[PDB]
Amino acid sequence: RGSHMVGRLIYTAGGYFRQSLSYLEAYNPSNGSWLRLADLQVPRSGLAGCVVGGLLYAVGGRNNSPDGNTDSSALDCYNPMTNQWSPCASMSVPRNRIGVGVIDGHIYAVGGSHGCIHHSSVERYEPERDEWHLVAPMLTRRIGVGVAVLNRLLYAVGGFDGTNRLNSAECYYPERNEWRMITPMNTIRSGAGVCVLHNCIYAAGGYDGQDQLNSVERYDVETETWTFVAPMRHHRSALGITVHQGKIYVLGGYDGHTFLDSVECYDPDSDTWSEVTRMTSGRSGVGVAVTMEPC
Numbered sequence: 001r002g003s004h005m006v007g008r009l010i011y012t013a014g015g016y017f018r019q020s021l022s023y024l025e026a027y028n029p030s031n032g033s034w035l036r037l038a039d040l041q042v043p044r045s046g047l048a049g050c051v052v053g054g055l056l057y058a059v060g061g062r063n064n065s066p067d068g069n070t071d072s073s074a075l076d077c078y079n080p081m082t083n084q085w086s087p088c089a090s091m092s093v094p095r096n097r098i099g100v101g102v103i104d105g106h107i108y109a110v111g112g113s114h115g116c117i118h119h120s121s122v123e124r125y126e127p128e129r130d131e132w133h134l135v136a137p138m139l140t141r142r143i144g145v146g147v148a149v150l151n152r153l154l155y156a157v158g159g160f161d162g163t164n165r166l167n168s169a170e171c172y173y174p175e176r177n178e179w180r181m182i183t184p185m186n187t188i189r190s191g192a193g194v195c196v197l198h199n200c201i202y203a204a205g206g207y208d209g210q211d212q213l214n215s216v217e218r219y220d221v222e223t224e225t226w227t228f229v230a231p232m233r234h235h236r237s238a239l240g241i242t243v244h245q246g247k248i249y250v251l252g253g254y255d256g257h258t259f260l261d262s263v264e265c266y267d268p269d270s271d272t273w274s275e276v277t278r279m280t281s282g283r284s285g286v287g288v289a290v291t292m293e294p295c
C-alpha cells in the first residue's frame, strides 16, 4: 500500500508529559525513521486523530498547562503536502478524552468530558461542508472511550461514566440513527486503545479502576463474543493505537510508573507483540492516524 506514489506513516499528535503537548511526529515502519513536523497550534492531550481524504484531523482534547486547563472543542486539519495546520469548524461542545471514528468520509466525535460532566452526545463532521451536526446520543455517558468502525457501523467501547469504569460497549447504525448495546467486554477498560483488524474490534490496555492493563481482547462481530489474545509487553492506559499494513501499533501511554515511549506491534498471524521503535519522548493521551509521507 503506497498512497499516490509514496509510503504511509504513523502520525502521533499531541499528548501529555508534565503538561499537554503540541508535538506532531511521524514514524515510518518501512525504515524505522521518525520525523518532527509542524506543531499543533494549541497543545492538547486526550484528543483523537483520524484521516479523511489524505488529511490528518486532530479532534477534541484538553490543554493542561501552567496558565490553565481548557477543554477543547477544536477540529484542526494537517495537510502533509504543505506541512501546515488549518482550523476547521469547532464541535458543539468541548470533548476531552474523546473517541473518534470515520464512516463514509464523515468524522464521528463520541463522548468525552467538559469540566465535571461526562458526555453521551455524539456529533458528525462533514468535511465537504465544514459543518458539525449532532446525531443520536449513546445509551451511556462515556469518557476515555475507544471507538472503531467495522462494516459501516460505529462502535463505542468502555470508558468512564463519572462513577464507574465500564466494560460495556455499544454500536451505532447510521441509517436508523440508533445505538444498541453489544456484548460487554470481559474486562473493565477506560482509556484503552480500540481499533479494527479484519472482522474484529480490538481493545488493548486501559485502566480498570485499580491497575493499568496489558491484556488485549477482540470482539468477533459474527459470533458476538470477546476473546483474549496475547497481552502487550507493557501495561498501558491512555495509549495511542492504529493499524498499518495489517498489524496493530500501540504508542506510549502510562503504566503506573512511567510515561512510556515504547511502541509495540501486534502480528495477528503469530499472535505476538514486539517492540518496534521508541517515540522521541514518553507521553500519554496522543492522537494517532495513518496517511501519506509529508513534504
Ligand SMILES: COC(=O)/C=C/C(=O)OC
Residues within 6 Å of the ligand: 016, 045, 046, 064, 254, 284, 285
Ligand atoms: C492529560 O492526561 C493526564 O493528565 C494523565 C496523567 C496520568 O495519568 O499520569 C500520572
Ligand SMILES: COC(=O)/C=C/C(=O)OC
Residues within 6 Å of the ligand: 051, 052, 053, 054, 055, 104, 105, 290
Ligand atoms: C476522500 O474521502 C475518504 O473517505 C478518504 C479517507 C481516507 O483517506 O482513508 C484513510
Ligand SMILES: COC(=O)/C=C/C(=O)OC
Residues within 6 Å of the ligand: 191, 207, 212, 237, 254, 255, 256
Ligand atoms: C482516578 O484514578 C486514576 O488514578 C486513574 C489512573 C489512570 O487513568 O491510569 C493511568
